[PDB]
TrEMBL record:
This is Histidine triad protein D. Signal peptide: none annotated. The chain holds residues 270 to 340 of 839 of the full protein.
């Protein structure tokens, strides 16, 4: 399972940044940096604050990885 998730995440990192989610303050979503996960989305740190990103704001691939990556 770990190897499968790593291969999928490698696939995401291989896409152009234009196809990945960016927050209004510039933060690029990275599933490997998820610190908390709920039913509506995930939390990622960004210095002195955390973002919460709803799954629906991510691409389908980004959502899949956000849901399955093991914390
Ligand atoms: Zn931020």
């Amino acid at each position: 399972q770990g190897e499968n998730i790593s291969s999928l995440l490698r696939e995401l990192y291989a896409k152009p940044l234009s196809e990945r989610h960016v927050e209004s303050d510039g933060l690029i979503f990275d599933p490997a940096q998820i610190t908390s996960r709920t039913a509506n989305g995930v939390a990622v740190p960004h210095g002195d604050h955390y973002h919460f990103i709803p799954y629906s704001q991510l691409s389908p691939l980004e959502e899949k990885l956000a849901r399955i990556i093991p914390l």
